[PDB]
């Protein structure tokens, strides 16, 4: 179902609506594109523009609040646009960070219309969209050099999300009505280089599963069982993948690992009966 040459500039992200019927591509050309996919067809609708620097990542909001797609660019700003009347418009612009923003994912509709922003400005922001338009932002420093990922943890307070460091550190953050904002929990060390990406699973089974990919060219699957329980570092393999590692994605169900390399190859992984990993 290829959509050959969607952009002019190299593409940095390919995400779909909750109903895999409409896509969203973003590139360096500072532009994002909306799509329609059927059997093998690709209808190109609008092309989102207002981004000064290369767009990095984008994320589809839950249909619960209509059609909304958020994008983050080098321009140190993340922007969201809705699709009222089949015509794409820019609803709000979030630019609190001072430097590139490399990741932006939406919170489980349960939580609400929340967006988690992680900038290379070393900080991270949490923003929910009220009514009138003016939101109440929440920012908290998260890493030394910077921040590269900010995946969320499923619903359960009890609001958690993992961060990937520019300083090689993976962290866990849980809300706190007494602290007024998300505070640190874990600080799982493991990578020798920078944490390129970290995604948290929705697999509600007995134990929690977290993925961490990095310039150190390895994935460390962080498995923990309960509050007490510490996270068990686990090398996806006791060798190095020839190139870096940029993305890690969790399948809806069946909990399978989508590990987008850098050697330009995508690999899939599963945890056999023991607790190790194998292809698919």
């Amino acid at each position: 179902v290829v959509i050959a040459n969607a952009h002019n500039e190299m593409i940095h992200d390919a995400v779909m609506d909750y109903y895999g019927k409409r896509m969203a591509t973003c590139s360096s050309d500072k532009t994002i594109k909306i799509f329609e996919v059927e059997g093998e067809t690709h209808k190109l609708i609008d092309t989102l523009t207002g981004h000064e620097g290369p767009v990095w990542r984008v994320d589809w909001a839950h249909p619960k609040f209509g059609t909304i797609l958020a994008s983050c660019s080098y321009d140190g700003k993340v922007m969201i646009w809705k699709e009222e009347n089949g015509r794409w418009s820019q609803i709000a612009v979030h630019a609190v960070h001072s430097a590139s923003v490399n990741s932006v994912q939406w919170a489980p509709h349960e939580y609400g219309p929340m967006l988690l922003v992680a900038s290379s400005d070393g900080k991270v922001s949490v923003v929910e969209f009220k009514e009138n338009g003016t939101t109440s932002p929440i920012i908290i420093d998260a890493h030394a050099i910077g921040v590269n990922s900010a995946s969320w943890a499923p619903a359960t307070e009890s609001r958690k999300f993992v961060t990937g460091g520019a300083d090689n550190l993976v962290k866990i953050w849980k809300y706190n009505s007494d602290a007024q904002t998300y505070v640190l929990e874990s600080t799982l060390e493991g990578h020798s280089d920078w944490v390129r990406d970290v995604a948290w699973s929705p697999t509600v089974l007995l134990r929690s599963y977290m993925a961490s990919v990095s310039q150190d060219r390895t994935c460390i699957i962080w498995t923990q069982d309960n509050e007490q329980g510490p996270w068990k570092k686990t090398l996806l393999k006791e060798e190095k993948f020839p190139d870096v590692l940029w993305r890690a994605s969790w399948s809806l169900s069946g909990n399978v690992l989508a590990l987008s390399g850098g050697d330009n190859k995508v690999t899939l992984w599963k945890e056999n009966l023991e607790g190790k990993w194998e292809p698919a």
């Binding site: 390919a14 779909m16 895999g20 990095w56 590139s100 490399n102 993305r247 809806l252 850098g262």
Partner: peptide
């Protein structure tokens, strides 16, 4: 910052984007 990576994503119905 150049992410030539296939940057894949699982999505609705077990489809793998990239």
């Amino acid at each position: 910052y150049g992410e030539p990576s296939p940057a894949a994503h699982w999505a609705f119905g077990g489809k793998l984007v990239q």
